[PDB]
Design a protein around this ligand. Structure first.
Ligand SMILES: [Mn+2]
Ligand SMILES: [Zn+2]
Ligand SMILES: [Zn+2]
Lengths: 860, 74, 37, 108, 71
């Protein structure tokens, strides 16, 4: 009779899914915070299903207390009007019966997409198939989950966009209903089925002055909005033709505000469609997080530099007088004159006239948006093959090398590339997709990363303080035509930097093909950022860069020469103090072509927090806008035609290494945050209190709490050490904690990368060494061997050494001396063939003293 | 089980013309007639009364979570 | 290999050596000879 | 000083191709004289270049002597490969280089 | 500009593979296109057996410096 009663007058075609009247525990996701525990994890919870064949619609019954029963009944009776509330049913012991709820709640979907694990990802497959997003047979195509391979997974995911949008609209309706009904409460993901309805009003409070706390909800749900393209239905007229947006329209500010009010009505924080109105860098990040989502509706031709026709001596040009970022909104210059050296420099770098006075182009080889050809015929570039060194190969074979089965064998070669290789390489930018970040979590992580970077000092400097190295380097597209950076630095600069704080200067960068030895035939590219960008980025950052490059014992070891025992000191430092020391590493799949825009902007902002005294807010904002327009969404001249670069790091700017270090530290910190919050707190006391206060500072506080920031920094420095160099890290983490999940494991890094970088990190490309006596397996393409002199030594791969020796490009012995210096530590390797490698080089060098090559490892 | 505000704070007396005791400096949320300005020395301007004959006062520039703590405790 | 054949599509003895190789470092000197000519 | 003279000469000689008449109308049609840089060539270009990977794309894009792109009408006037190519040759696909450059012009 | 070719020839004769030697000696019969795995040759070749389907002579006349075709 219970099954009959649970469905009174609404198509009671149900089938039991539990055990009679007994409840039905399940391993679902939840968001718990009540004065004992706080996090986003899975917990063990009388569910029924409706038969159409069966369809996903369930009657989730519960048993509660009379107090909660009446408390929920009153609020439901006061909220039944809105259509975004799941039809409830109350009767009696108290039983509350929901109706027509989906199998899985939004919380389960978000957790599955944020804690992905191919080993156990059944829930994600079930969700995908249940809503016709794909077909079950799609999962027999192993490697389906990857993003870099099988890009059709994006199409498969995008089938949930309509469901996500409907959920957002119903949530806004529910918030309006509560506010009009005078109910105050907190809004959580785990109380909304995938259809959009709501339930579980057991912790609300009681007209016209209600206020729901909806910060955690949107903050946690944000990442799933750019993944499933929830706002792709806003480009239609109202199954309809695309909106015929006027080509000349570029403001969209009113549309931005309308979208914000339609979907983020109750986000009780000022939103500035133009980020120039922001009060602090935290506000800039908060507003850019929304601009990222809202930029995926408007036509892609609106973005880019905004040009206005100005006149000089009656000669009309077409130059940019602003820019339209997808993140920082519209930005209008300030020192602009409509009538009339540095002027030439700013004007030439502008893509305005270059794209205006060029032939239209439609490249069908790639998918990246094109702009305009700069010539009549496209250009095809080729890469020559290596240059065999007969003498060295004969010398090596004479010494009994390369015998069948020998451990050392050539594996590194100069590979040759055909004509259409540069464009194929550039087309790899298709891996950079829009990404919405958890804004509150990112706002905590930025503070923690700044605390990491607190040991350094710096600020803006003049043109007589910047140190310039490698003056002979490519300048930029219009600039490489007549010289390199040396010519420009020898001509002028301070005013240009001052002007750079009051305007925006878009620039163009060339993407060539590099010619270097590697173990894979994939083409590799080197980009040269325009001189007008590096000139100012140096003045902005060089003090801090040199401060980090000359600091010893820090978390980032950039610039720490491994000679003279440096490796030993670094290894001891990372092994400062850990109860159960271990080691761990990882590799980022396509770091420079997949890291989202928000993380790069955050890194740039963090690197600029040294200017609280030298610069005001507006100057820093225009510096950020310059950086974003110049090294994030720049225009790239690949071949002989211009393309718009969707994102990713620029491999030519001097701040790529340190920005990557900031991004890596942010990834590690967020991995720790997810591991600690996702750890079931109910299962020690200090750690539980620390995670409670971590959750409070993330999703309850609205301002910095320096005390807890310091506490968490110390906690990580103690129980989770790390040694960071751009896109290359080593860890020394308390093994027992990681086993208990109190620090960042490797699956945590996997999931973080999956849901925040749109890539997949293969577990075969990351290692773990449990015996500290043998240090990290691989770091900076180096290996470590514990020898007696007892110290650690860096020894490379013998195959790479032999390959580099055999094939040397055109244009001497210094290369062999360097190889021997890097090869001396092999002498102490247990293997005999490895030891023979160093002697071969020494014997060969004489044909052209081990004490000299030993002196570079005794610390003095 | 995300609770609104457990272990809610208590009453306090303030000069005028509910506290949130933060170790990094005391901060008053709401002072439970029209009193446009309140003083504590620091001035804290107040919002229009919330009739319910007592009245409640909110400081302009208050988020939607603190209003939950203030209204939930009341 | 693909470079020695593709690079000819735009530009006979050096086909057989490159595909029928078991150790690698022989073909990687063939491609330079064709490219120079 | 050499860079200064070369820089401006590149600017001057690069303005004569701007087509002021066709550009003035589109600029003046703007609300405040600001237009996105992307749509400048899209609507004030006297030539189009189409790089094609193979014949399958050629069938769906440049079939015939006139093709419409950018909500306009273009007529092919020349085809090139990685050497001139006659439109009768394209059909025989393996005998042609992949990157065909189908230039065109705008039809008034 | 002969050092590269002499080095290449010495390396080839050092390899000592019959398939390579056969075609190298024949050149001193030359192909007209890339050897597949149909072939045009100015039947055993390159240590492989080819079945002949059609032949041509100097004046481009089929015959039951000539031109040989095989699969
Ligand atoms: Mn619930
Ligand atoms: Zn803002
Ligand atoms: Zn500054």
């Amino acid at each position: 009779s219970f099954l009959n009663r649970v469905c009174g007058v609404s198509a009671a075609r149900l089938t039991p899914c539990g055990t009679g009247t007994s409840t039905d525990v399940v391993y679902r996701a939840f968001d718990i915070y009540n004065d004992k525990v706080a996090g986003f994890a899975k917990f063990l919870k009388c569910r029924f299903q409706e038969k159409d064949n069966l369809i996903d619609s369930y009657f989730v019954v519960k048993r509660h207390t009379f107090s909660n029963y009446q408390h929920e009944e009153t609020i439901y009776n006061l909220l039944k009007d809105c259509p975004a509330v799941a039809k409830h049913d109350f009767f009696k012991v108290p039983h509350i019966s929901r109706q027509r709820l989906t199998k899985y709640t939004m919380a389960d979907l978000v957790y599955a997409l944020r804690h992905f694990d191919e080993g156990n990802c059944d829930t994600l497959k079930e969700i995908l198939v249940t809503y016709n997003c794909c077909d079950d047979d799609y999962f027999n195509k192993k490697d389906w989950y990857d993003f870099v391979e099988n890009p059709d997974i994006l199409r498969v995911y995008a089938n949930l966009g309509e469901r996500v949008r409907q959920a957002l609209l119903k949530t806004v309706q529910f918030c309006d209903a509560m506010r009009n009904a005078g109910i105050v409460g907190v809004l959580t993901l785990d109380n909304q089925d995938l259809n959009g309805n709501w339930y579980d009003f057991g912790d609300f409070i009681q007209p016209g002055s209600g206020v729901p706390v909806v910060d955690s909800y949107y903050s946690l749900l944000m990442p799933i909005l750019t993944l499933t393209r929830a706002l792709t239905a806003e480009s239609h007229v109202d199954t309809k033709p695309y909106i015929k947006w006027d080509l000349l329209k570029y403001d969209f500010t009113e549309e931005r505000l309308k979208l914000f009010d339609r979907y983020f009505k109750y986000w009780d924080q000022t939103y500035h469609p133009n980020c120039v109105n922001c009060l602090d860098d935290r506000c800039i990040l908060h507003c850019a997080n929304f601009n990222v989502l809202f930029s995926t509706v408007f036509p892609p031709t609106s973005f880019g530099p905004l040009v206005r026709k100005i006149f000089v001596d009656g000669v009309p040009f077409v130059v940019s007088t602003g820019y339209h970022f997808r993140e920082l909104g519209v930005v209008h210059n300030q020192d602009v004159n409509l009538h009339s050296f540095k002027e030439l420099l700013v004007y030439a770098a502008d893509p305005a006239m270059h794209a205006a006075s060029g032939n239209l182009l439609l490249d069908k080889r790639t998918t990246c948006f094109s702009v305009a050809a700069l010539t009549n015929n496209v250009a095809f570039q080729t890469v020559k093959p290596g240059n065999f060194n007969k003498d060295f190969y004969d010398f090596a074979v004479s010494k009994g090398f390369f015998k069948e089965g020998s451990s050392v064998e050539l594996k590194h070669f100069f590979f040759a590339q055909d004509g259409n290789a540069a464009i194929s390489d550039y087309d790899y930018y298709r891996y950079n997709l829009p990404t919405m970040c958890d804004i509150r979590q990112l706002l905590f992580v930025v503070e923690v990363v700044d605390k990491y970077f607190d040991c350094y000092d710096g600020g803006c400097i003049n043109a007589n303080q910047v140190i310039v190295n490698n003056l002979d380097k490519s300048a930029g597209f219009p600039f490489n035509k007549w010289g390199k950076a040396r010519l420009y630095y020898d001509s002028m600069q301070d005013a240009l930097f001052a002007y750079t704080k009051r305007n925006v200067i878009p620039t163009i960068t060339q993407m060539n093909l590099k010619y270097a030895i590697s173990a894979k035939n994939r083409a590799r590219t080197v980009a040269g950022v325009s001189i007008c960008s590096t000139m100012t980025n140096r003045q902005f950052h060089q003090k801090l860069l040199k401060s980090i490059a000359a600091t010893r014992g820090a978390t980032v070891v950039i610039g720490t020469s491994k000679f003279y025992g440096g490796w030993h000191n670094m290894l001891k430092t990372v092994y400062s103090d850990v109860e159960n020391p271990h080691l761990m590493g990882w590799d980022y799949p396509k770091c420079d072509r997949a890291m989202p825009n928000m993380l790069r902007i955050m890194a740039s902002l963090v690197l600029a927090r040294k200017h609280t005294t030298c610069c005001s807010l507006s100057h820093r904002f225009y510096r950020l806008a310059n950086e974003c327009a110049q090294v994030l969404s720049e225009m790239v001249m690949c071949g002989g035609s211009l393309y718009v670069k969707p994102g990713g790091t620029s491999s030519g700017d001097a701040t790529t290494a340190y920005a990557n270090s900031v991004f890596n530290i942010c990834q590690a910190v967020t991995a720790n945050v997810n591991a600690l919050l996702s750890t079931d707190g109910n299962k020690d006391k200090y750690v539980r209190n620390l995670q409670h206060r971590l959750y409070e500072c993330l999703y309850r506080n609205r301002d910095v709490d320096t005390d807890f920031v310091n506490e968490f920094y110390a906690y990580l420095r103690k129980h989770f050490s790390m040694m960071i160099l751009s896109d290359d890290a080593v860890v020394c983490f308390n093994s027992t904690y990681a086993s208990q999940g109190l620090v960042a494991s490797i699956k945590n890094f996997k999931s973080v990368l999956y849901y925040q970088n749109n890539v997949f990190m293969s577990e075969a490309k990351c290692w773990t060494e449990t015996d500290l006596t043998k240090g990290p397996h691989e770091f900076c393409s180096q290996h470590t061997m514990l020898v007696k002199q007892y110290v650690y030594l860096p020894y490379p791969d013998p195959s790479r050494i032999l390959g580099a020796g055999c094939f040397v490009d055109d244009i001497m012995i210094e290369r062999f001396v360097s190889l021997a210096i890097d090869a001396y530590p092999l002498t102490k390797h247990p293997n005999q063939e490895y030891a023979d490698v160093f002697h071969l080089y020494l014997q060969y060098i004489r044909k052209l003293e081990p004490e000299f090559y030993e002196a570079m490892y005794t610390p003095h | 089980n995300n609770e609104l505000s457990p272990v809610a704070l208590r009453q306090m007396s303030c000069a005028a013309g509910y506290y949130n005791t933060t170790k990094g400096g005391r901060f008053v949320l709401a002072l439970l007639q029209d009193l446009k300005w309140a003083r504590f020395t620091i001035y804290t301007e107040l919002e229009p009364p919330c009739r319910f004959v007592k009245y409640l006062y909110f400081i302009k520039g208050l988020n939607n979570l603190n209003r939950g703590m203030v209204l939930g405790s009341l | 290999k693909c470079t020695s054949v593709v690079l000819l599509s735009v530009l006979v003895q050096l086909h057989n050596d490159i595909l029928l190789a078991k150790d690698t470092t022989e073909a990687f000197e063939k491609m330079v000879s064709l490219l120079s000519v | 000083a050499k860079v200064t003279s070369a820089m401006q000469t590149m600017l001057f000689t690069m303005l004569r191709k701007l087509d002021n008449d066709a550009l003035n109308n589109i600029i003046n049609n703007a609300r405040d004289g600001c237009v996105p840089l992307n749509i400048i060539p899209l609507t004030t270009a006297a030539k189009l270049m189409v790089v094609i990977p193979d014949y399958n794309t050629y069938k769906n894009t440049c079939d015939g002597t006139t093709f419409t792109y950018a909500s306009a009408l273009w007529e092919i006037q020349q085809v090139v490969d990685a050497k001139i190519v006659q439109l009768s040759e394209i059909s025989n696909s393996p005998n042609l280089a992949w990157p065909l450059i189908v230039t065109a012009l705008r039809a008034n």
